[PDB]
Amino acid sequence: RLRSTPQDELHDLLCVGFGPASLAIAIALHDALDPRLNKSASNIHAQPKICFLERQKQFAWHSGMLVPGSKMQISFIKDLATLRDPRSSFTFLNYLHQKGRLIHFTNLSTFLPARLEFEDYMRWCAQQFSDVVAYGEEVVEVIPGKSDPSSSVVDFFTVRSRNVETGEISARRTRKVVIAIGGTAKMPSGLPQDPRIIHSSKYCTTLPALLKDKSKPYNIAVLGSGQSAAEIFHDLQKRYPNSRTTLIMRDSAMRPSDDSPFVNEIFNPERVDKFYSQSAAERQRSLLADKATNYSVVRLELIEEIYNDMYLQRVKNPDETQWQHRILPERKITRVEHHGPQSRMRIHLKSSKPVKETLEVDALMVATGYNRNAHERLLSKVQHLRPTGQDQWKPHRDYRVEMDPSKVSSEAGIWLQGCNERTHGLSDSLLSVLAVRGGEMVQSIFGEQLERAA
Amino acid sequence: RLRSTPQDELHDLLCVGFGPASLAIAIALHDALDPRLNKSASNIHAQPKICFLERQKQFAWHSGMLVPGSKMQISFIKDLATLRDPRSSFTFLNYLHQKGRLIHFTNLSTFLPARLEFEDYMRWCAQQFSDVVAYGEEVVEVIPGKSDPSSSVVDFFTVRSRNVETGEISARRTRKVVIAIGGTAKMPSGLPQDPRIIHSSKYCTTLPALLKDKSKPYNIAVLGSGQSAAEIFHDLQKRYPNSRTTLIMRDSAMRPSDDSPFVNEIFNPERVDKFYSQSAAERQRSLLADKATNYSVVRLELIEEIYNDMYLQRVKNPDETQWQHRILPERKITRVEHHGPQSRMRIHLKSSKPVKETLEVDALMVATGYNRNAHERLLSKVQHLRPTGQDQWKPHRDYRVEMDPSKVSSEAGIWLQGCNERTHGLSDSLLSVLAVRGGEMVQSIFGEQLERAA
Amino acid sequence: RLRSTPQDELHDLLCVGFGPASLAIAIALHDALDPRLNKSASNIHAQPKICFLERQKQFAWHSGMLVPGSKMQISFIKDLATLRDPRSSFTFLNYLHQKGRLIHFTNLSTFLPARLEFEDYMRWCAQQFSDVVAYGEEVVEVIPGKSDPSSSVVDFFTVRSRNVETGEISARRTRKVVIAIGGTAKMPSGLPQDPRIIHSSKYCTTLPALLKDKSKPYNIAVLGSGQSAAEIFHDLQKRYPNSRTTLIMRDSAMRPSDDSPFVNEIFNPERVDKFYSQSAAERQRSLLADKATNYSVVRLELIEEIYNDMYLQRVKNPDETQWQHRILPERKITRVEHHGPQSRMRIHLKSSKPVKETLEVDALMVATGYNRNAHERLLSKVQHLRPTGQDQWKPHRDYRVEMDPSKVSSEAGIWLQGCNERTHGLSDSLLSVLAVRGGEMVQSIFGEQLERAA
Amino acid sequence: RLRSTPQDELHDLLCVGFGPASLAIAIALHDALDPRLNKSASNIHAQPKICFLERQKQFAWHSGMLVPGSKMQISFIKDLATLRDPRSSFTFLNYLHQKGRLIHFTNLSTFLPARLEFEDYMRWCAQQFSDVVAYGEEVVEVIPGKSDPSSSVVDFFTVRSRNVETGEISARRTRKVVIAIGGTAKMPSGLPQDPRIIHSSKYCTTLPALLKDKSKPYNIAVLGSGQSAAEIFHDLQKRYPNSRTTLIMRDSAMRPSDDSPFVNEIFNPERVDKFYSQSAAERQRSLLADKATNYSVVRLELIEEIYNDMYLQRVKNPDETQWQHRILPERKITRVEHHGPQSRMRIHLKSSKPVKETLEVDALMVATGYNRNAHERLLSKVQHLRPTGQDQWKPHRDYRVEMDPSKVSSEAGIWLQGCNERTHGLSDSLLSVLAVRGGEMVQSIFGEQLERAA
């Protein structure tokens, strides 16, 4: 139903990225314009001029970490529509019904679909917006624009994207921009660059290209102790059955993720209001107090599964140093030799406490998480539009960043999505509040036009 | 939206009973007439003349067995709309959203709502049809009618109902009837009539009236080993903390209900087709082979809970004969003395194998299940409209009973709901297929009118 | 401590088979002779002359079905000593302590060790009796003996065993014999002999020899729906990742094993008394009523795991006929073509109801359970010592078979172990009562000598 | 077997307290002297002169917190003997066997006995040492003694105890002392003294005496968010069915206890060596990093149970302020009015963040945990025997406190048990290492005598 806008026309909304965050906005807009769900939508005149720019060739949801068997870490009810409107055609349950699979999923008695299934649910959602999404487009910069060039008022933005295949630059003009680009791979600064040192985000993509023979006796190390590291470490024994694997962590042990009901309530959509209204001190204190819900934590079932495997090695061999798969707690990497004639790097280890063994490995999987600062690069040319002296983007409750009112028209603005954890809570980078947030976003961006019909 | 029909007018549909079975038909009709869900509904002219007759004063779902804590025995996905259309406003999830309770239910991580909650979900559904439901109306008979009295063709039915409060008889004429009246309480024929002998269906209703003091030291017996007996036996220790309870069963032990996924697939809506198409031999054989999914079975968690309580008695006292709460396996009642001057009846027991103890009790809770033959009484006057010599109602796949084509107009008919287990499967008397069956029913009854618009 | 008896000497006890049943007798005897556990053992004079004959080269516990990951189906508390005496050095917990593994097993929070671990526990037990066990000895016949050849009284037995490696026959004389030889592989009589048709008992042993390349695209069928079939079917997708597998069952679905607490109590050691004392009618009726505890049943977790895998195939492909791993319910094999030039047999299928597809397979795994009648062949020459006209062995409560008192001395006898399900219950062929039964056996066999010391 | 020593004689060991810690020492000594378990014990000459002093009238294990239904928070394998020797007659499993209850406990499939059952297991253990335990004896002071009064060398200690019933002081002389007195109730310093303000440790003891009518409509508050608070809060709705309850916590939510396998390994007996050998910095850092295993945490099942109850209140009433049972997160008590004429105290609340409601309550249950500094009072007169200038007791690895070698004979010493968390780990105050620690203690105290026999 959402028809495309020609590249040359001034858009109402331009969204950078087409992952879950932007997809949920697209769904919310569809629903707000659906007369079947929003009775006032029968009176809307023109369709808003909207466009989504995605750098991937097609919709994919963390494809490099689509480890076989890997499950969702959130209830399917927290899909892209249900918490806002269970009547929506974009719910996970309606998707299953459409695929002829609803009765079968029911028989599984689980709230946790496979990652592979949930990606397909979101792929199914994404495809219905193909006319308004430009794939293979990496946005490189956002530039302020003045429709009256002689004035001192900014009232639009130019979004410039590089074609991933051809390398050419395109420009699209919009009144309002949304940055929903997720996070970048975080690597420890001490580790050197080498094709054998690969971030977890590229596990399914890059590793099989490097270690082509699945039956060879490789030595493979994993750095980290989060969900990503545990998943890779568990997968390696299956993917490379004859390989010797090592898990290197600086903590003493893998620790369970906390989804206990009372604690879990921080992820409730209505709690964003309460969290935002807290002071910087209480917000920082609150984030630290509830960290075990999301960061440096592993799902209990996975910890137990790994532990069980470790015990089975003990049954077969009482000598820990002879085990095929090992875990080295409270260790840090101090040096990596990678200029030797052999295919194996040499990793020097020490205690993580305030010296130890050396490992020879064919590959080092680095599962050290993500940073969320990629938007900063894209927004460098619009920095001067912030209030004088303010050197950081300040998102409001509605995610619209603060800009000097005397420099920027009220019709122009920039919204940030999925990088606002410090201001909005631990549900910000997740799927938790996407259905509800998407609806709030549509009301914040298209509210004026939707009021005319209401 | 469904407007009432005056009592004097010829109805298109008259439904006897307004429990889940009829409620799901009402919901399906609403949805078939909703242009938002069925695009062809924009062209329908007149609303069908429909009426539901319910004997209870208001909607209640097995209120006599609303034991505190009692849970659902089926996934909430198998509600009254979802398996047919997850977009419907009558889904369990939309209900929760409407009550402002969806995020909270999500945090429970359960597919099994409390019975109390699910009744309220269905109460919420039922209330939106209050204009087309006549409460306090017990249907007593269905009578064949001929619009041309001199002809030999029946083309309508008179439905006669007794007002529960006033005792007066009313009559409503309809082309099509649905009998969806559930089941009647089954009592062992050997047990005599006494106010102290109460069926499980009346546990919350009748027992507190008989045993008014909750702190008194009563002796209370429970007969049976199904879900009802286990629930009552478990509840009694809480409801009457100082009472001595006994569970009398003829089996050796309580046995778990089977909801293992492969086995559970017999409850799939599309399987009704496959089950109906089987022969009488294969259907009888199939029902017997899968009995542990529904009959004489208890949910595992409840069995374990009871067992745990029994063990705690063993910790406190190694003498089984001194226990406050006891279970007597493989026993049958042979005689009940109930003419003695005391308040306690005397129950004589024997082995159930092809003699034993005597119990003195203030009340005997009889949890011996249900029969489904109440429709037979209401349909006695229409029996002669069946094909010559046929002494049982033969429901088709679409639940319409066979009638002689030369005696009954094609516009007239009678449908049976919830009593067709032998022909339609073990999902027939349950909630399992209600959403889908309701939709099939609407197509079978109102199909002609809905085709004109489609 | 148990010293060996020379082959030529008259033994007090000769045991045929050294599996769990006989191992538990050996342990019980050790414990009865241990002054630390039985205070009267300080006064015993001579060690009884005992010998165990085992056909396997060394102790192994169903080695052909040691599928990777396969777990125990019984609590570790029901090991070979604990239920009789938790102080015994032969308990599972003491074994773990001896291996330096007790604290680690504790951290697993499971009552269900790996099959591989529990076999090693029993191997550990078995090794301490190596001096009184003759491995590589297959017993072929038991012969009545008369120390006075001119009399008509039997007072000993000759046990004849064939050396598995050399083929020679040895003879050992004993007053008392125990037959504890477990069960033989049951094959459907309709299936023809072929190296590609293999019983489940030989899965780990025989299949890898036939299908040597684990990466080849084989077609592999599994017949059955018990624990063995489910385990093999689940394992095949891992063992042969590129092979197309089929599960052929005559039932409609895999059904869960019943270990619900009240029901499980039939396995209690003290219940053997109660079960034995029942009539043939009640025993047959009782066995049939509780069949789901042991036969044609699969552990719930495994059913769910398989079901989950099947659903994952549905996610990837909605076409069931294209799935790599398939299950064909309610089917029976009617013909097997196996004289064709290709490596694949052709299996003709029909409905199991009172016609279907053809499968081409490289191997057929037959998981159709076991028979327990091997003792009959070994006892043919002693049949005439039973009471006149009695054509079946009648074991007493103490497992000693009935023999004519005028033909057999009171000092001579034959005991049956693990084949007495019809007389002793569903715990007879299991590990359930082994600790307690072993102790009863020692008292039944060595009671006279142990009374002198007591 | 352990015979009593007359009060006047010099003891080898005097133990202050007869709870789990001391009980495990008694058991270890029994086992070390049992020739059946320790082969060298056949050669020991004299029984050591040992005595245990307990202030309670008889053995009781946290009797004031024996809330109905309350379960163990540790595997039964970590009983008072098993991890040291599974052959011991003092194991939990042997206890069950002795009570005729082993097969039944097995059928529960749980590692977590009821608190009531486990106390009875330890009561059963304790009774076999009744001849060497003096009940009703509260130790008040430990005094250094010099057998040569003119010398400057201490070589014994006088232990002085007050009879709880009569008030008289008794004195017992010993070479070696063990202080195993557990912890004292910790109350917030801001709360005033009042009979209506009761510590959790006295919940079952003191509250029913204050609130005698269980059916009255009381207002009852609970302060805290640990296991104790959750247990009391959950129990109150059952114990006082018509009472309005409030949970006051300064944290945002109840948080789950961590027993994930890898993390749980800190509780392994052999890990005490590794923990003790760490520096003060690493030990403090380690304790803080693993706090969620023991402190301010609730068992997941209990959190969920409470949460479920809270949701059921939401079903019945959407207004949180009308709920019978409520939880007030992030609150602190600032003032308590308790001089008013009514029976209800007035509690003034504020936010716990760096103002709120007032509660009127009949009782305030204070579940604010325990302190472990009671030994300091008893050891004041022996303080000067520590090395010059050292103002804190420094326990060695073997739990023997450091004393000046020139002041104290090598035959004299004082050991601390259950208060050494800072030096020995999080397993110190628990049941976790009691079996193993008890054995280490016996070797540390009676080692010289046991070497003569070995």
Ligand SMILES: Cc1cc2nc3c(=O)[nH]c(=O)nc-3n(C[C@H](O)[C@H](O)[C@H](O)COP(=O)(O)OP(=O)(O)OC[C@H]3O[C@@H](n4cnc5c(N)ncnc54)[C@H](O)[C@@H]3O)c2cc1C
């Ligand atoms: C392996 C993994 C599994 C997870 N699973 C869960 C889960 O089970 N439940 C849960 O609640 N949370 C989960 N998360 C958290 C995760 O952040 C969210 O599920 C989700 O990815 C957030 O969506 P987003 O759109 O904000 O970011 P993303 O999903 O990363 O979407 C960003 C998109 O923008 C595109 N993009 C980036 N830069 C540019 C550019 N310059 N120009 C154009 N396009 C660009 C990217 O290609 C990407 O498609 C998971 C995270 C990971 C890494």
Ligand SMILES: Cc1cc2nc3c(=O)[nH]c(=O)nc-3n(C[C@H](O)[C@H](O)[C@H](O)COP(=O)(O)OP(=O)(O)OC[C@H]3O[C@@H](n4cnc5c(N)ncnc54)[C@H](O)[C@@H]3O)c2cc1C
């Ligand atoms: C205690 C209990 C709990 C259950 N819980 C579950 C569950 O968890 N999940 C599940 O799938 N199945 C469950 N069932 C099965 C149950 O049959 C269905 O949930 C459901 O009740 C079937 O609906 P129905 O309309 O066919 O029958 P009913 O629900 O019995 O509805 C029949 C209605 O017709 C009315 N009526 C009867 N006779 C007349 C008359 N002569 N005139 C007018 N009105 C009349 C009655 O008042 C009643 O309201 C349960 C059954 C019981 C007894």
Ligand SMILES: Cc1cc2nc3c(=O)[nH]c(=O)nc-3n(C[C@H](O)[C@H](O)[C@H](O)COP(=O)(O)OP(=O)(O)OC[C@H]3O[C@@H](n4cnc5c(N)ncnc54)[C@H](O)[C@@H]3O)c2cc1C
């Ligand atoms: C794969 C599998 C797994 C099982 N797991 C469980 C479980 O988890 N828990 C449970 O309670 N039950 C289980 N069982 C049931 C099983 O019957 C018992 O665990 C156990 O094997 C019974 O011991 P047994 O000594 O009676 O028979 P077996 O264990 O079969 O021992 C018989 C021994 O006698 C030897 N023998 C046979 N014939 C001769 C001869 N002519 N001469 C000399 N020696 C001979 C055999 O080599 C064998 O070693 C399992 C069964 C199978 C097939």
Ligand SMILES: Cc1cc2nc3c(=O)[nH]c(=O)nc-3n(C[C@H](O)[C@H](O)[C@H](O)COP(=O)(O)OP(=O)(O)OC[C@H]3O[C@@H](n4cnc5c(N)ncnc54)[C@H](O)[C@@H]3O)c2cc1C
């Ligand atoms: C309610 C509760 C439940 C618990 N449950 C668990 C559990 O499930 N698992 C677990 O591992 N840990 C648990 N714990 C931890 C607990 O500390 C240990 O289980 C155990 O109590 C430690 O034993 P102890 O002998 O060191 O201390 P205690 O058990 O407190 O024993 C001290 C004894 O010394 C006596 N005493 C004190 N002062 C004197 C004196 N001056 N003179 C004479 N006698 C004195 C006391 O009467 C008492 O009997 C629990 C703690 C509490 C409060």
Ligand SMILES: NC(=[NH2+])NCCC[C@H](N)C(=O)O
């Ligand atoms: N199929 C099975 N699960 N067999 C094992 C049965 C063991 C039995 N439930 C017991 O506790 O002793």
